[PDB]
Amino acid sequence: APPNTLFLRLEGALQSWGSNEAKFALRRTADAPTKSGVLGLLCAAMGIGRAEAADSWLPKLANLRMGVRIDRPGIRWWDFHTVGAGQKTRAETLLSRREYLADASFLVALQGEPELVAKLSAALAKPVWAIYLGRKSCPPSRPVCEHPPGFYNTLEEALSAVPLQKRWHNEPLPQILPCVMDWIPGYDGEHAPDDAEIHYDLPVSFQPPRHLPRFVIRRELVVGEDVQVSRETGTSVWRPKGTRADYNNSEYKKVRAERLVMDHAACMVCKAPATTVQHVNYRRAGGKEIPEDLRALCRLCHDACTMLEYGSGMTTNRIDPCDPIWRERILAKRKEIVEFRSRGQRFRKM
């Protein structure tokens, strides 16, 4: 089946779709992408300049029906923007305020002719020029060409075949999804209904910018009956590995014996029958260590090594007994253990 509709995902950290009430200094977003807004994004996708687009490309593109579904309705944030005149000639500074929509997501569906939709979707996979969201200081956070086309039906049906993506586990959700749709003719309701508002977003020209009124209707959707909630992919919260060493799984129990044969049953520093193994590099533990990470030791020398690294703040690189810099401290601790230990206490505890 030939494609009928086209899907656009508009979501970023900041975005702003200006309205006609922005006349002198205060620039305001309306609530949602407009027809003239998205049909400058499509025009910049196929590389059509401000001239040569009004006479040819705009009338065919304006012959479309589009609807916007709103999730994360956005929080309006204002910005104090100053333009420095000078740095006519004066040292004056012009002040203005600009409005942005923070943390918003919009799904736009444009329905029309099949091959025009195919050309538009082919253009969106590699846009000719830079693509932003309303103003050039607002890049998208998700790819615009993220959902495939299809031979769907009228805009309410086209705004139901997209899942509602989430981002983390306890992400709050709205039960209602308001949607804004273009009015539809048909000669039964040939006159505009009572609940229809008027928007000035029908583009004709861009360099001497020209906009025409367009009747706009509003509807609603409910999650669970029309749109199914999806789930996030990947991992968001990042934590260091930090694998605590285990002395009970089979892999470490075989690696330890392999190391105890690699050194011929001799403690490394004092050269006595080794009964234990001490790690050096800790960033392999949990059952993935290599025999080169481990060094064989006896009870006295490993107790001295444990004493020497109790509160030293060593995370991954621990004491290496083969290092000839740690020899003196290990020998002194061994002498202290020989002088002060009591075998009776250890024999009594076990």
Partner 1 sequence: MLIEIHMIQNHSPANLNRDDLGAPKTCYFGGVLRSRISSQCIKRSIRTSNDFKALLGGVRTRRLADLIQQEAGETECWKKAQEILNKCGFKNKDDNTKMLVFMSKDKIKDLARIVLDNSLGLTEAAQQVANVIAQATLAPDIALCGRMLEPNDKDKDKKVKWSNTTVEAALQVAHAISTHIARPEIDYFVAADDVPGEDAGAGHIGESMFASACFYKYFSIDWEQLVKNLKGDTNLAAHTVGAFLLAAAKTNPSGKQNSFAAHNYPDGILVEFKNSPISYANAFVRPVSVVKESDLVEQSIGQLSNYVNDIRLGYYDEQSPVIGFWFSPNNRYPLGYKHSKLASRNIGNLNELVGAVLDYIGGFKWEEVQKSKAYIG
Partner 2 sequence: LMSNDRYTFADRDWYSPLFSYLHAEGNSRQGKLWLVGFASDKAKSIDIWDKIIELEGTDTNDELLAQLANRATALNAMRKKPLRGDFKKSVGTPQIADIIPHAENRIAINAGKMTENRGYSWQDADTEYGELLTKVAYSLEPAQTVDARLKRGNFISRKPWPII
Partner 3 sequence: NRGTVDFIASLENLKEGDLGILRKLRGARLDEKLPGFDLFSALWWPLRQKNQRAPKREVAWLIAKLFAEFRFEQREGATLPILMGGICRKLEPKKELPRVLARFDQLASLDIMQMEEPLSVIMGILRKHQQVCLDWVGLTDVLSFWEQEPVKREWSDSFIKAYKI
| Interface residue list for partner 3 (CB under 8 A) | 244, 246-248, 303, 306-308, 310-311, 333, 336-337, 340-342, 345-346, 349-350
Q: Which of 43, 155, 298, 330 binds Zn ion (CB under 5 A)?
A: 298
- Choose the one of Zn ion, partner 3, partner 1, none that binds residue 168, judging by a C-beta under 5 to 8 angstroms depending on kind: partner 1
Q: How crowded is residue 255: how many other Cβ atoms within 10 Å of its Cβ?
A: 20
Please state, in angstroms and rounded to a whole number, the distance separating the CA atoms of residues 307 and 269: 16
Residue 305 is labelled as binding a ligand: no
Residue 267 is labelled as binding a ligand: no
Q: Which of 78, 129 has the CB closer to partner 2?
A: 78
Q: Which of 23, 239 has the CB closer to partner 3?
A: 239
Q: How far is CA 171 from CA 74, 114, 154, 226, 268, in A?
A: 15, 37, 31, 20, 55
Please state, in angstroms and rounded to a whole number, the distance separating the CA atoms of residues 287 and 243: 9
What is the torsional sign of CA 113, 5, 68, 233? negative
Q: Which of 23, 88 has the CB closer to partner 2?
A: 23
For residue 234, state whether it binds partner 1 (rule: CB under 8 A): yes
Minimum CB separation of residue 345 from partner 3 in Å reads: 5
Phi, psi of 13 (to 5 degrees): -65, -40
Residue 270 is labelled as binding a ligand: yes
Tell me the pairing of strands 197-205 and 294-297: unpaired
Please state, in angstroms and rounded to a whole number, the distance separating the CA atoms of residues 221 and 9: 18
CB neighbour list of residue 307: distance below 8 Å, 6 or more residues apart: 333
Q: Which of 162, 307 has the CB closer to partner 3?
A: 307
Could you give the string, one character per residue 129-158, with x where binding to partner 1 holds by CB under 8 A and - elsewhere?
A: xxxx---xxxxxxxxxx-------------
Please state, in angstroms and rounded to a whole number, the distance separating the CA atoms of residues 331 and 188: 100
Map the footprint of partner 1 across residues 176-215, applying CB under 8 A: none
- Strand, helix or coil for residue 54: helix
Q: List for the chain the helix, strand, coil content (%; round to 5).
A: 25, 30, 50
Question: Tokens 């011929």 identify what position?
Answer: 264
- Choose the one of partner 2, partner 3, partner 1, none that binds residue 215, judging by a C-beta under 5 to 8 angstroms depending on kind: none
Tell me the pairing of strands 26-27 and 93-111: parallel
Please state, in angstroms and rounded to a whole number, the distance separating the CA atoms of residues 72 and 105: 6
For residue 75, state whether it binds partner 2 (rule: CB under 8 A): yes
**Chain Cα centroid distance, residue 209:** 35
- Choose the one of Zn ion, partner 1, partner 3, none that binds residue 238, judging by a C-beta under 5 to 8 angstroms depending on kind: partner 1
Q: Which of 155, 319 has the CB closer to partner 3?
A: 319
- Choose the one of partner 1, partner 2, Zn ion, none that binds residue 235, judging by a C-beta under 5 to 8 angstroms depending on kind: partner 1
Residues that bind partner 1 (CB under 8 A): 12-14, 50, 75, 77, 79-81, 85, 95, 100, 102-103, 125-132, 136-145, 167-168, 233-240, 242, 310-313, 315
Residues that bind partner 2 (CB under 8 A): 21, 23-26, 28, 75-78, 80, 95-97, 99
- Known binding-site positions for Zn(2+): 270, 298, 301
- Known binding-site positions for Mg(2+): 270, 298, 301
